[PDB]
Amino acid sequence: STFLPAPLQCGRFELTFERPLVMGILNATPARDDALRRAERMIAEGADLLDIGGESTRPGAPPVPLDEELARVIPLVEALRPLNVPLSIDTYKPAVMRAALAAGADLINDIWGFRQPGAIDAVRDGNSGLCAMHMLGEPQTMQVGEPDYGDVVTDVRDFLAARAQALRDAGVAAERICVDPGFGFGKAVVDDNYALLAALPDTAPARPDGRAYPILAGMSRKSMLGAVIGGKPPLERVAASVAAALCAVERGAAIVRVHDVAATVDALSVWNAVRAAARQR
Amino acid sequence: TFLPAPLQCGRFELTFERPLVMGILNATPARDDALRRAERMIAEGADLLDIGGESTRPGAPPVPLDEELARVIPLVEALRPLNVPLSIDTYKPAVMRAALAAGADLINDIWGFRQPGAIDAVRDGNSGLCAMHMLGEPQTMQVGEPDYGDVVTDVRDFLAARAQALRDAGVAAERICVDPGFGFGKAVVDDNYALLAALPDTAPARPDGRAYPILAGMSRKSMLGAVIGGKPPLERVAASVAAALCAVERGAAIVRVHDVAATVDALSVWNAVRAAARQR
Ligand SMILES: Nc1nc2c(c(=O)[nH]1)N=C(CNc1ccc(C(=O)O)cc1)CN2
Ligand SMILES: Nc1nc2c(c(=O)[nH]1)N=C(CNc1ccc(C(=O)O)cc1)CN2
Ligand SMILES: [Cl-]
Ligand SMILES: [Cl-]
């Protein structure tokens, strides 16, 4: 406060964060026209980016075969490109990264932090945005591991610092990179996730210009929320998800990744109005 | 971490380790529909219930005394056994008198105990008292056009005078909370959002040096519609949650809301964040 996240080069777009941006989650997982209507609705509700995922990229989910992931993701990229809204791709598979970038996606959002063999090579060229997330696990297994940290905030920051360095060593400009602490990925459901949310600014390492890498935060409908509201199921977590998104932007998040776009946008309109009033004092 | 000063509140001593949620119980048509609503809001996590028999809002037509009493008193009598603080949203001294005699715990007055006879009605006993700021003329009960130097300072100075008037009549400072009165004589965005941004500065000091605890009510109000493209009241729930969270972040003791479950859930997240912060 009154913090300004560093800019993100994001394929066709140069994102700046005078206000935090809302990334609407477009799960392309049961048809195509169903997903396109969803995307149009989310844009109408105020989504600033769309995150296209052909898999369940969460802990304990079945891993989708390559041909099918390609068949879900690529035609949505092609159909949504004309809308001139950033298209993020939720994938850790280098082949999906290559095909999706060739199809004209703007951002690669990777739960494995570009650790899968060949992912860095897939993304090093061009201008796409890249979100390196923290997940505790061994990449070869494709499985999230058990929580284990000294200070989870420090460990998450150092890992993200190493991932940004690895991207930069391969020629990726620092301005194309954002980071994400990976809420719900190898974290104690309450203690680790809320430590990371309370200390969000400190999860982000510094770019060479001294500015912190901008932060993407995704908590929407997650177990960390169910755990504090008496165990209600995902569809009953909207108000809690709005609360978490607001907390993240209060703590300097550049982008919030959400299911409930209208509700998040409305909440962020109120947040911006408060900030605008505070700036006159 | 801010800890709002405690509120002596009739049968209850309220302390604010966490902010409390006051559920709005609009008792306007019946006297039984209101009761199931109250039970639901308690089940959803309401810490207080605000019983209102009128429209205590700018431009709203008034309800005659005997009708307001017919709506409020049976509800006080019916809800007392539930053992949750009962607040009465009234500016009428006769309703204040009758509600306290029926056993209400808190009097919530949009006129800041300015109506003739109000202070005299609430002097005695241990009821909590919420003195709200509204810019207007008590005699005609008309809200005024916004007019402030620094609205934050003007609101605080008014609330200091109302607290002092209550104390001059023998009211213990511990019984008093204050409310900047969002949407009552305020520029819809300029003034309301200044007050929310500078919320802790709207409360004057008690004699012990702690600020009077703050009640804030923004649920579904125009200030919210104004910033979300002019959506109507029933479509302001997400914006109302954001406002409540902002208010507690800025030290509010009680938030007054229509959407109890949604607000309680948001505050559960907020509490979890604070608890994590306190371990660092
Ligand atoms: N950059 C980025 N990408 C994602 C994220 C995320 O948080 N950040 N979350 C995702 C959803 N995965 C889940 C993880 C945990 C939970 C849960 O805790 O319930 C649910 C879903 C997938 N893709
Ligand atoms: N202590 C306290 N009591 C109240 C309050 C309130 O904000 N604080 N609001 C009330 C509802 N009045 C409205 C005022 C403004 C608006 C609006 O701006 O839309 C709507 C309703 C009545 N009772
Ligand atoms: Cl835990
Ligand atoms: Cl205005």
| Separation CA B9–CA B49 (nearest Å) | 13
Closest CA to A245 of A261, A259, A256, A234: A256
CB A203 within 8 A of CB A153: yes
> Hey, of B273, B274, B278, B280, which one would you mutate to test binding to chain A, going by the most A CBs within 10 A of its CB?
B273
CATH superfamily of the A1-281 domain: Dihydropteroate synthase-like (3.20.20.20)
> Hey, of B219, B224, B265, which one would you mutate to test binding to chain A, going by the most A CBs within 10 A of its CB?
B265
User: Residue type at A203?
Assistant: T
Return the ∠ at Cα A231 (arms to A228 and A232), rounded to 5°.
Answer: 110
Please name the helix (run of DSSP H) or strand (run of DSSP E) that holds residue A226, with its range, or none: helix A223-226
Closest CA to B177 of B137, B206, B141: B206
Catalytic residue list contains B256? yes
Closest CA to A15 of A103, A105, A85: A85
C-alpha separations of A176 from A6, A16, B207, B274 in Å:
11, 12, 56, 33
Residue B142 structure tokens: 């008309």
C-alpha separations of A68 from A36, A65, A72, A108, B13 in Å:
18, 6, 6, 18, 62
Inspect the interface and report whether the beta carbons of A272 and B224 lie closer than 8 Å.
no
Closest CA to B106 of B186, B203, B200, B213: B213
> Position of tokens 């702690």?
B210
CB B135 within 8 A of CB B149: no
Other C-beta atoms closer than 10 Å to the C-beta of B101 total: 12
Tell me the Cα Rg of chain B.
Answer: 17
| Separation CA A167–CA A207 (nearest Å) | 12
User: Residue type at A153?
Assistant: V
Method: X-ray
- List the beta strands (DSSP E) in A11-167: 13-15, 21-27, 49-53, 87-90, 107-110, 129-133, 137-138, 143-144
Residue B34: phi and psi, rounded to 5, are -60, -40
Residue A80: phi and psi, rounded to 5, are -90, -20
CB A239 within 8 A of CB B266: yes
DSSP tag of A49? E
Closest CA to A191 of A145, A136, A148: A148
Which residues on neighbouring strands pair with residue A241, listed in sequence order?
Answer: none
Fold topology of B1-280: TIM Barrel (3.20.20)
C-alpha separations of B93 from B64, B78, B123, B160, B245 in Å:
13, 22, 11, 21, 33
What residues 203-232 of chain B have any CB closer than 8 A to a CB of chain A?
224, 227-228, 231
| Separation CA B265–CA B253 (nearest Å) | 17
Closest CA to A164 of A187, A133, A185: A133
| Separation CA B278–CA B280 (nearest Å) | 5
| Separation CA B106–CA B178 (nearest Å) | 12
Closest CA to B239 of B55, A237, A250, B230: B230
Say whether A77 sits in a helix, a strand or coil: helix
Residue B180 CB contacts under 8 Å (≥ 6 apart), including other chains: B132, B133, B155, B159, B195, B199, B202, B214, B216
Show the 3-state SS of chain B. Answer: CCCCCCEEECCEEECCCCCEEEEEEECCCCCCHHHHHHHHHHHCCCCEEEEECCCCCCCCCCCCHHHHHHHHHHHHHHHHHHCCCEEEECCCHHHHHHHHHHCCCEEEECCCCCCCCHHHHHCCCCCEEEEECCCEECCCCEECCCCCCCHHHHHHHHHHHHHHHHHHCCCCHHHEEEECCCCCCCCCCHHHHHHHHCHHHHCCECCCCCECCEEEECCCCHHHHCCCCCCCHHHCHHHHHHHHHHHHHCCCCEEEECCHHHHHHHHHHHHHHHHHHCCC
Could you tell me the resolution of this structure in angstroms? Answer: 2.0
C-alpha separations of B178 from A199, A211, B17, B278 in Å:
32, 42, 18, 28
| Separation CA B10–CA B128 (nearest Å) | 6
A chain contacts of residue B194, beta-carbon cutoff 8 Å: 277, 280-281
| Separation CA B76–CA B195 (nearest Å) | 32
CB A80 within 8 A of CB A36: yes
